[PDB]
Motif scaffolding. Structure first.
Motif, PDB file in Angstrom:
ATOM      1  N   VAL A  41       5.148 -14.301  -9.627  1.00  0.00           N
ATOM      2  CA  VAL A  41       4.765 -14.892  -8.334  1.00  0.00           C
ATOM      3  C   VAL A  41       5.931 -15.690  -7.783  1.00  0.00           C
ATOM      4  CG1 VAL A  41       3.213 -16.493  -7.197  1.00  0.00           C
ATOM      5  CG2 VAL A  41       2.363 -14.860  -8.934  1.00  0.00           C
ATOM      6  N   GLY A  42       6.312 -15.356  -6.554  1.00  0.00           N
ATOM      7  CA  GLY A  42       7.407 -16.030  -5.866  1.00  0.00           C
ATOM      8  C   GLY A  42       7.348 -15.597  -4.401  1.00  0.00           C
ATOM      9  N   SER A  43       8.437 -14.992  -3.906  1.00  0.00           N
ATOM     10  CA  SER A  43       8.466 -14.426  -2.547  1.00  0.00           C
ATOM     11  C   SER A  43       7.628 -13.154  -2.447  1.00  0.00           C
ATOM     12  CB  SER A  43       9.883 -14.116  -2.101  1.00  0.00           C
ATOM     13  OG  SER A  43      10.553 -13.234  -2.988  1.00  0.00           O
ATOM     14  N   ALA A  44       7.100 -12.875  -1.244  1.00  0.00           N
ATOM     15  CA  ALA A  44       6.316 -11.662  -0.994  1.00  0.00           C
ATOM     16  C   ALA A  44       7.158 -10.401  -1.212  1.00  0.00           C
ATOM     17  CB  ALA A  44       5.710 -11.678   0.414  1.00  0.00           C
ATOM     18  N   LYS A  45       6.478  -9.349  -1.688  1.00  0.00           N
ATOM     19  CA  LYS A  45       7.087  -8.014  -1.825  1.00  0.00           C
ATOM     20  C   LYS A  45       6.684  -7.180  -0.620  1.00  0.00           C
ATOM     21  CE  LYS A  45       9.307  -5.020  -4.622  1.00  0.00           C
ATOM     22  NZ  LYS A  45      10.739  -5.243  -4.931  1.00  0.00           N
ATOM     23  N   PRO A  46       7.564  -6.878   0.325  1.00  0.00           N
ATOM     24  CA  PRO A  46       7.122  -6.197   1.536  1.00  0.00           C
ATOM     25  C   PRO A  46       6.492  -4.852   1.239  1.00  0.00           C
ATOM     26  CG  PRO A  46       9.223  -7.261   1.882  1.00  0.00           C
ATOM     27  CD  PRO A  46       8.978  -7.299   0.396  1.00  0.00           C
ATOM     28  N   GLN A  48       2.675  -4.830   0.603  1.00  0.00           N
ATOM     29  CA  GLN A  48       1.692  -5.327   1.550  1.00  0.00           C
ATOM     30  C   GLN A  48       0.731  -4.267   2.036  1.00  0.00           C
ATOM     31  OE1 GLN A  48       1.217  -8.552   1.906  1.00  0.00           O
ATOM     32  NE2 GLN A  48      -0.488  -8.304   3.332  1.00  0.00           N
ATOM     33  N   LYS A  49       1.142  -3.025   2.240  1.00  0.00           N
ATOM     34  CA  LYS A  49       0.175  -1.988   2.652  1.00  0.00           C
ATOM     35  C   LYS A  49      -0.921  -1.785   1.633  1.00  0.00           C
ATOM     36  CE  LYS A  49       1.966  -0.310   6.574  1.00  0.00           C
ATOM     37  NZ  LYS A  49       3.440  -0.535   6.600  1.00  0.00           N
ATOM     38  N   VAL A  50      -0.585  -1.936   0.334  1.00  0.00           N
ATOM     39  CA  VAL A  50      -1.603  -1.854  -0.719  1.00  0.00           C
ATOM     40  C   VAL A  50      -2.563  -3.003  -0.612  1.00  0.00           C
ATOM     41  CG1 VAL A  50      -1.965  -1.921  -3.221  1.00  0.00           C
ATOM     42  CG2 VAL A  50      -0.035  -0.620  -2.280  1.00  0.00           C
ATOM     43  N   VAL A  51      -2.044  -4.253  -0.519  1.00  0.00           N
ATOM     44  CA  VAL A  51      -2.907  -5.442  -0.433  1.00  0.00           C
ATOM     45  C   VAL A  51      -3.856  -5.335   0.740  1.00  0.00           C
ATOM     46  CG1 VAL A  51      -2.705  -7.922   0.186  1.00  0.00           C
ATOM     47  CG2 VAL A  51      -1.395  -6.894  -1.743  1.00  0.00           C
ATOM     48  N   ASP A  52      -3.363  -4.817   1.888  1.00  0.00           N
ATOM     49  CA  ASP A  52      -4.189  -4.831   3.108  1.00  0.00           C
ATOM     50  C   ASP A  52      -5.310  -3.804   3.100  1.00  0.00           C
ATOM     51  OD1 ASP A  52      -3.044  -6.984   4.077  1.00  0.00           O
ATOM     52  OD2 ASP A  52      -1.516  -5.842   5.263  1.00  0.00           O
ATOM     53  N   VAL A  53      -5.298  -2.804   2.227  1.00  0.00           N
ATOM     54  CA  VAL A  53      -6.407  -1.847   2.144  1.00  0.00           C
ATOM     55  C   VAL A  53      -7.465  -2.248   1.127  1.00  0.00           C
ATOM     56  CG1 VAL A  53      -5.497  -0.238   0.412  1.00  0.00           C
ATOM     57  CG2 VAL A  53      -6.765   0.674   2.314  1.00  0.00           C
ATOM     58  N   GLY A  58       9.265   1.282  -2.592  1.00  0.00           N
ATOM     59  CA  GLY A  58       9.226  -0.116  -2.206  1.00  0.00           C
ATOM     60  C   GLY A  58       8.619  -1.039  -3.236  1.00  0.00           C
ATOM     61  N   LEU A  59       8.199  -0.532  -4.395  1.00  0.00           N
ATOM     62  CA  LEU A  59       7.662  -1.315  -5.484  1.00  0.00           C
ATOM     63  C   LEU A  59       8.683  -1.532  -6.624  1.00  0.00           C
ATOM     64  CD1 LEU A  59       4.106   0.227  -5.661  1.00  0.00           C
ATOM     65  CD2 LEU A  59       4.731  -1.917  -4.548  1.00  0.00           C
ATOM     66  N   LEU A  60       9.889  -0.967  -6.504  1.00  0.00           N
ATOM     67  CA  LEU A  60      10.864  -1.050  -7.585  1.00  0.00           C
ATOM     68  C   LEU A  60      11.745  -2.297  -7.427  1.00  0.00           C
ATOM     69  CD1 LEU A  60      11.945   2.809  -7.525  1.00  0.00           C
ATOM     70  CD2 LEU A  60      10.152   1.675  -8.863  1.00  0.00           C
ATOM     71  N   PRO A  61      12.278  -2.843  -8.531  1.00  0.00           N
ATOM     72  CA  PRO A  61      13.345  -3.843  -8.454  1.00  0.00           C
ATOM     73  C   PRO A  61      14.690  -3.168  -8.157  1.00  0.00           C
ATOM     74  CG  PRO A  61      12.964  -3.304 -10.717  1.00  0.00           C
ATOM     75  CD  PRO A  61      11.971  -2.450  -9.905  1.00  0.00           C
ATOM     76  N   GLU A  62      15.751  -3.957  -8.021  1.00  0.00           N
ATOM     77  CA  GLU A  62      17.098  -3.432  -7.788  1.00  0.00           C
ATOM     78  C   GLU A  62      17.633  -2.644  -8.970  1.00  0.00           C
ATOM     79  OE1 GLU A  62      19.817  -6.563  -6.773  1.00  0.00           O
ATOM     80  OE2 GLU A  62      18.885  -6.939  -4.845  1.00  0.00           O
ATOM     81  N   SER A  63      17.512  -3.223 -10.154  1.00  0.00           N
ATOM     82  CA  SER A  63      18.042  -2.614 -11.371  1.00  0.00           C
ATOM     83  C   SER A  63      17.057  -1.724 -12.084  1.00  0.00           C
ATOM     84  CB  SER A  63      18.435  -3.736 -12.336  1.00  0.00           C
ATOM     85  OG  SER A  63      18.962  -3.337 -13.556  1.00  0.00           O
ATOM     86  N   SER A 103       9.119  -9.720  -7.521  1.00  0.00           N
ATOM     87  CA  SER A 103       8.407 -10.906  -7.071  1.00  0.00           C
ATOM     88  C   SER A 103       7.390 -10.493  -6.017  1.00  0.00           C
ATOM     89  CB  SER A 103       9.373 -11.919  -6.447  1.00  0.00           C
ATOM     90  OG  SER A 103      10.255 -12.450  -7.401  1.00  0.00           O
ATOM     91  N   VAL A 104       6.202 -11.035  -6.143  1.00  0.00           N
ATOM     92  CA  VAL A 104       5.123 -10.896  -5.175  1.00  0.00           C
ATOM     93  C   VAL A 104       4.609 -12.295  -4.799  1.00  0.00           C
ATOM     94  CG1 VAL A 104       4.496  -8.694  -6.204  1.00  0.00           C
ATOM     95  CG2 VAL A 104       3.261 -10.756  -6.856  1.00  0.00           C
ATOM     96  N   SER A 105       3.954 -12.437  -3.640  1.00  0.00           N
ATOM     97  CA  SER A 105       3.532 -13.793  -3.271  1.00  0.00           C
ATOM     98  C   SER A 105       2.186 -14.123  -3.891  1.00  0.00           C
ATOM     99  CB  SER A 105       3.450 -13.958  -1.751  1.00  0.00           C
ATOM    100  OG  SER A 105       2.429 -13.090  -1.249  1.00  0.00           O
ATOM    101  N   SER A 106       1.894 -15.453  -3.950  1.00  0.00           N
ATOM    102  CA  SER A 106       0.595 -15.903  -4.420  1.00  0.00           C
ATOM    103  C   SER A 106      -0.517 -15.259  -3.620  1.00  0.00           C
ATOM    104  CB  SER A 106       0.491 -17.430  -4.355  1.00  0.00           C
ATOM    105  OG  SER A 106       0.699 -17.923  -3.042  1.00  0.00           O
ATOM    106  N   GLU A 107      -0.318 -15.113  -2.307  1.00  0.00           N
ATOM    107  CA  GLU A 107      -1.337 -14.505  -1.457  1.00  0.00           C
ATOM    108  C   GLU A 107      -1.556 -13.037  -1.770  1.00  0.00           C
ATOM    109  OE1 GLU A 107       1.329 -16.354  -0.304  1.00  0.00           O
ATOM    110  OE2 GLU A 107       0.408 -18.028   0.648  1.00  0.00           O
TER     111      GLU A 107
END
Ligand SMILES: [Cu+2]
Ligand SMILES: [Zn+2]
Length: 260
Positions: free
Chosen positions: A149-154, A157-162, A182-187, A216-220
């Motif tokens: 949990v930290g910054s939002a993962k853009p 968000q489409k998953v969270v909203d459905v 869009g769910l992967l980290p850099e490395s 990182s994903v947000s608390s929300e």
């Protein structure tokens, strides 16, 4: 597989062995990843995550988690390289998560629990279908990614909203045109070991590939996971939280690292 297993006190991981005796087997998952004991393996080939043509179809609440399902009738999204021989096709992804930010992952890293864990599930195309693949010791490959949990993962968000449309067991919704990249980290640095499905039927078919870098994903965002229900519509509400199996004995296995 079979009915009535879950994550409660009366049907959770400590009970599964009575109907699924492989729960006490020789290559069960998840495990604790002891980072100091894992060994760098120069024989690992580069890992290739090839998801550009991935075709998402649907999102389903199955009473244990939610799955985002893909068209796997062709090699549209595949995993190759690393410890893998051949081509593994993406069929679905899902998560495991906690009631609190300090728990939720299945794998642990030096006994640290993350808030959640993403599993991208793939089957070995040499076996023709998923059901045949789960009869083979190299039938599946699951790419595991930790969530903190930290910054939002853009890209999440489409998953969270459905999720408000699939609150209860048995509900599904269209989920076309989603990019799982869009769910992967850099490395793509990873640990790998031979293991199992982490839910019943607990079958010992999986090459696990667990990425070192969390997303990182947000608390929300994670709070929206925790509003799902294990139960069906019209039944007593049971929040879908703590749908993780704890770490299992390593037994006669070595965890390999792709990185020094
Ligand atoms: Cu049953
Ligand atoms: Zn899983």
């Amino acid at each position: 597989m079979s009915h009535h297993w879950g994550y409660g006190k009366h049907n959770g991981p400590e009970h599964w062995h009575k109907d699924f005796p492989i729960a006490k087997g020789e290559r069960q998952s998840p495990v604790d990843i002891d980072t100091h004991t894992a060994k760098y393996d120069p024989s690992l080939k580069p890992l290739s995550v090839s998801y550009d043509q991935a075709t998402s179809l649907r999102i389903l609440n199955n009473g244990h988690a939610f799955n985002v399902e893909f068209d796997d009738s062709q090699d549209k999204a595949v995993l190759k390289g690393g410890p893998l021989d051949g081509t593994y096709r993406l069929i679905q992804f899902h998560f495991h998560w906690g009631s609190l930010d300090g728990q939720g992952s299945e794998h642990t890293v030096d006994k640290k629990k993350y808030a959640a864990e993403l599993h991208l599930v793939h089957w070995n195309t040499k076996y023709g279908d998923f059901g045949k693949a789960v009869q083979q010791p190299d039938g599946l490959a699951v790419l595991g990614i930790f969530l903190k949990v930290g910054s939002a993962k853009p890209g999440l968000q489409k998953v969270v909203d459905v999720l408000d449309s699939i609150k209860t067991k048995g509900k599904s919704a269209d989920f076309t045109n989603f990019d799982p990249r869009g769910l992967l980290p850099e490395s793509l640095d990873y640990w790998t070991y031979p293991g199992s499905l982490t839910t019943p039927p607990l079958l010992e078919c999986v090459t696990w590939i667990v990425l070192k870098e969390p997303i990182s994903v947000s608390s929300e965002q994670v709070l929206k996971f925790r509003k799902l229900n294990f139960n069906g519509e019209g039944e007593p509400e049971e929040l879908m939280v703590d749908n993780w199996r704890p770490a299992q004995p390593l037994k006669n296995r070595q965890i390999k690292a792709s990185f020094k």
